[PDB]
Amino acid sequence: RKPEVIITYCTQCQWLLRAAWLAQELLSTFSDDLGKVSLEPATGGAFRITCDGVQIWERKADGGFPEAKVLKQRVRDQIDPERD
Amino acid sequence: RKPEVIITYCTQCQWLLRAAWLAQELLSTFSDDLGKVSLEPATGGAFRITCDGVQIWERKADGGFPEAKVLKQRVRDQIDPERDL
Amino acid sequence: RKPEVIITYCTQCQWLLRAAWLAQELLSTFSDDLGKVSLEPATGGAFRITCDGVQIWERKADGGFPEAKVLKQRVRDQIDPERD
Amino acid sequence: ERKPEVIITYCTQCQWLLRAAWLAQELLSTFSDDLGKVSLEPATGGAFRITCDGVQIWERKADGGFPEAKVLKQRVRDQIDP
C-alpha cells in the first residue's frame, strides 16, 4: 500500500492544465510518500480530489480550486497528521 | 471500464516533468476514451508506460523517451486502431 | 509588435510550476493575441506579472497567487477589453 | 549584466504549447540562475524554432522534429559564456 491521489476534472471546461499542475505540485513535495497521482477526465464542471478515496477538495464545496499550499497540507494531514 | 495508462518514472532522475507532459499530451488527445492517466513515482532510472498492463514504452526497451506522436499512435492502436490522428 | 506577458517567479521557492501553469493558461485562451509569455527567474521571493510593463499582479499587493480566472480577466482588460 | 534569454517559437493550432512549455520548464529547472528568461512565442505553419539570444539552437526542419531534454539542455549549456 501507499497513498494514491486522484484528481477528477471536467475536460470540456479546459481544466486539464490546472489538474496536471496540481498533480506535479503534489508529486514534487511528496515524491517519496505517494504511490501515484491520477488524472481522471470527467464532465459538467467536475473538479474533485481525493486521497485513498477521501475527498480533500471539491469545487462547489470548497469554493473553487485549491491553493497548492492548501492541497499539500490536506494531503499531508491525510498521510501523517504529525509530519511537517 | 475505459482503458487506463500509467507512466511510471524515476523521481530522482527528475523525470516528473516529462511524465507530466506526456500524460497531458495523452489526455488532450484521448479525453473521451481514457479512463485515467496515472503518474507513478519510482527509482533507478525507470521510465515505463503501460496502457492497461500492456507495455507501450520502456526506456531501455525503446531507447529513451517516446515522442509525442509515437506514444499517441501506440495508445491509439491499443484502444482505437481505426482512428486517424 | 504584440503584447508580452512576463511572470517573474522565485526559483528557490519552487514556484516555477505555477508560473509555467499560469503561462500555459494565458497562451491557451489568448493564443491569437499575445506575442509571447515569458518566465523570468527572480532571486528574491517574488511572483509578479506584467503585461507590456504594466503590472497586473503582485503576490504581496494582490494577496498571494492568482486564480487562472482572475488573471485571464486582468489580461483581457489590458489588451482585448471586448471579450468573454 | 544581461543574462541569456531563450525563446521557444511554436505553432499554436498544431497544439504545441504543451511540448514547448514542457521544454521551457526543463530549461528553467536546470538553469535557474543562468537564464534571464525563457519565452513562449505563439506562431503558425508548424514552426518550432528555439533561439538563445538570437542564436538558433534548434529548428524542427533543420534538426528533424523536436529536441530531447538531454540535447537542448546541452545546447543551452554550450551558450552560457563562462
Task: Give how far A71 is from chain C: nearest CA, Å.
Answer: 14
**Touching subunits for chain B (3+ Cβ pairs under 8 A):** A, D
What CATH number is attached to the domain comprising A41?
A: 3.40.30.10
Chains that touch D (3 or more CB pairs under 8 A): B, C
Neighbours of B14 (CB within 10 A): 13
Burial of D14 (0-12, 13-18, 19+ CB in 10 A): middle
| β-pairing verdict for C54-58 and C47-51 | antiparallel
Q: How far apart are CA A61 and CA A47, in angstroms?
A: 10
Q: How many domains does chain C have?
A: 1
- In SS3 terms, A52-67 reads as CCEEEEEHHHHCCCCC
Determine the angle formed by the axes of helices A68-79 and A16-29, rounding to 10 degrees. Answer: 50
Whether residue D21 and residue C20 make contact (CB cut-off 8 A), yes or no, is: yes
Helix, strand, or coil here: D76? helix
Burial C32-63 (b: 16+ CB within 10 A, else e): eebebbbbbbbeeebbbbbbeeeebbebeebe
Domain region containing A34: 1-84
The helix-helix angle for A16-29 and B16-29 (nearest 10°) equals 160
CA B61 to chain CA centroid, Å, is 14
CB contact under 8 A, B14 and D25: no
Q: Which residues of chain B lie closer than 8 angstroms to D27, CB-CB?
A: none
3-state secondary structure of D58: strand
B67–D66 C-beta distance less than 8 A = yes
Measured between CA atoms, the residue of chain C closest to residue D23 is: C20
Q: What is the CA radius of gyration of chain C?
A: 12
Query: What whole-number distance in Å separates Cα of residue B37 and Cα of residue D16?
Result: 20
Chain C environment of D33 (Cβ under 8 Å) = 11, 41, 43
Quote the CA–CA distance of D4 and D6 in Å, as a whole number.
7
Rounded to whole angstroms, the Cα distance separating C23 from C45 reads 18
DSSP helix/strand/coil, D75: helix
Check if the beta carbon of residue D10 is closer than 8 Å to that of residue D48: yes
The whole-angstrom separation of Cα D60 and Cα D45 is 11
Which residues does chain D have within 8 Å of residue B18's beta carbon, measured at their own beta carbons?
22, 69
CB burial of residue A83 (10 Å; 0-12, 13-18, 19+): exposed
- Which of C14, C18, C69 to probe the A interface (max A CBs under 10 A)? C18
| Separation of alpha carbons C13 and B8, rounded Å | 26
Q: How far is D44 from chain C (nearest CA, A)?
A: 10
How many Å apart are CA C73 and CA A31, to the nearest integer? 34
DSSP string across chain A: ---EEEEEEETTTT-HHHHHHHHHHHHHHTTTT-SEEEEEEE-TT-EEEEETTEEEEEHHHHTS---HHHHHHHHHHHH-TT--
What single-letter amino acid sits at D40?
L
- Structure determination technique employed: X-ray
- For chain B, the three-class secondary structure string (H helix, E strand, C coil) is CCCEEEEEEECCCCCHHHHHHHHHHHHHHCCCCCCEEEEEEECCCCEEEEECCEEEEEHHHHCCCCCHHHHHHHHHHHHCCCCCC
Residue matched to cell numbers 515524491 = A31
C-alpha span between C50 and A46 (Å, rounded): 31
